Subunit: 74 residues, 2 copies
Amino acid sequence: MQIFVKTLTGKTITLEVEPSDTIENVKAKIQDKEGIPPDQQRLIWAGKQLEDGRTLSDYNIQKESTLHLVLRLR
Amino acid sequence: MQIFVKTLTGKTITLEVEPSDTIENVKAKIQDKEGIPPDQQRLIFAGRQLEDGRTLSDYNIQKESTLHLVLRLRGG
């Protein structure tokens, strides 16, 4: 299925994912498409930071859902 | 000075801060007003998750700026 990942800087990308994809999986796909290291990525849904071991389905993230992405640089 | 803190779920508050306040200091103020423990807070400005030990001045966060608050809690 397709989801959207938007930064808070106005940048939007599409991703092809599966409901059973883990958040860690999704970060890997974002690295593949955009080059952003997973260690920097924090994905956000329902106002909160998602956990690497949980799946999209776990959070009721469905087709055409929009996630937020913010970056931690340290 | 005044800044705004907004969640990504439509909740907004005002906070009185100083430029020399660290992000950690800001989290303490949010806990004072909202009851949210600092470790459950993440603050965002211009797409960047802010580091706890740096200041509002370090990030060029000026009066009437908006910070985004993202929550962080195991299982949710």
